[PDB]
Design a protein around this ligand. Structure first.
Ligand SMILES: [K+]
Lengths: 252, 31
């Protein structure tokens, strides 16, 4: 996260860290959507251009965390994975279309002050909130700048959804209806973005109707970190909700 | 799933975090 700020304790209790077991390496963000299910980006797990293909035994998640490196006793929870599910039409060859994966925990996680699931959007919430100019919140422990510099506390930034034609014009990559983009205009004075390592984490919005937080997006891809006129791209969670449900309903 | 998206230390306590108003403002305009 660039130009974010430190999260308050318990501010994002669905935040999940995805780690490589050996060597210990923070890979990606993720989010808790039930006591057994974690949502992330497909490219965090499977990316053939980098000869990346993690199985359940390669990985672990950390839930309830605030500090990046510090062990938080009786609060953070480490879970192993029973199974990984990648969207069967995830497109790594071209444009990261359908950049979504589900991970089933080996054992359900106990909810607490610091561990609590986010909602998935229904059609009315999607209709209400996913509009150009409306802001969501992105969180993560990823880099603070371009990869070629790490926060100690979970970072938070609020970013406006960008009009689809402007998203399209920002990139030569073919965008799809399974993505949306978010970020400020050049010379707005305001800035902010997700960076390397924030991938797979949640873009959330709070409904004025029922006061619940909903995960509308997954940090997916972007041309640079906080570069002028380069908004971040997010997996459109509502558009892929039928797949999410089929997996949980079938394998839950 | 029934209790989703309501944070123990915020919504459940009728407390607001420091920047959530910025989101509400964007959905309506200003204030
Ligand atoms: K409005």
């Amino acid at each position: 996260i660039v130009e974010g700020s430190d999260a308050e304790i318990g501010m994002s209790p669905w935040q999940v860290m995805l780690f490589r077991k050996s060597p210990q390496e923070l890979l990606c963000g993720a989010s808790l959507i039930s006591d057994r299910w974690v949502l992330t980006a497909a490219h965090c797990l499977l990316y053939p251009p980098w000869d990346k293909n993690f199985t359940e035994n390669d990985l672990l998640v950390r839930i309830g965390k605030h500090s990046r490196t510090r062990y938080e006793r009786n609060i953070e929870k480490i879970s192993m994975l029973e199974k990984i599910y990648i969207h069967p039409r995830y497109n790594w060859r071209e444009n990261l279309d359908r950049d979504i994966a589900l991970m089933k925990l080996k054992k359900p996680v106990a909810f607490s002050d610091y561990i609590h699931p986010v909602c998935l959007p229904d059609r009315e919430t999607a209709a209400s909130l996913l509009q150009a100019g409306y802001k969501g919140r992105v969180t993560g422990w990823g880099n603070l700048k371009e990869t070629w510099g790490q926060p100690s506390v979970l970072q938070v930034v609020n970013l406006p959804i960008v009009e689809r034609p402007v998203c399209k014009d920002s990139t030569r990559i073919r965008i799809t209806d399974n993505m949306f983009c978010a970020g400020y205009k050049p010379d707005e004075g305001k800035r902010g973005d997700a960076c390397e390592g924030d991938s797979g984490g949640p873009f959330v919005m709070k409904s004025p109707f029922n006061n619940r937080w909903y995960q509308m997006g997954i940090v997916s891809w972007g041309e640079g970190c906080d570069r002028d006129g380069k908004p971040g791209f997010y997996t459109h969670v509502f558009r892929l909700k039928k797949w999410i449900q089929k997996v949980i309903d079938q394998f839950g | 799933e029934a209790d989703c998206g309501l944070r123990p230390l915020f919504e459940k306590k009728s407390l607001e975090d420091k920047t959530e108003r910025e989101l509400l403002e964007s959905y309506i305009d200003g204030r």
